Amino acid sequence: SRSAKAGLTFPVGRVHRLLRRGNYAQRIGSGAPVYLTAVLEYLAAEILELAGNAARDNKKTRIIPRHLQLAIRNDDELNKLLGNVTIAQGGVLPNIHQNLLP
């Protein structure tokens, strides 16, 4: 397929239809309409690897939403990318002030 011939796996045609419906431009760039899908695929691979690592850390086979929470929050670059958006049933990294301790 087009993704297979490109080495991709995300459905490019669905995104093409979405962009055509969104009418962000009359004639969208058809030289590489799956490129915007390729960058999203790279970001998704990053976040999925981090989530899988976080889930593996606490001996849980399945991706806990909290596991994804610390996976995204730990990375400073990820926090800069997406920091104004919260995640349902997420959490907060344990941050206790050293001078607060007795």
Binding site: N84, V85, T86
Partner: peptide, 8 residues
């Protein structure tokens, strides 16, 4: 509002 929530 500048504070987006994921999951819904």
């Amino acid at each position: 509002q500048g504070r987006t929530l994921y999951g819904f």
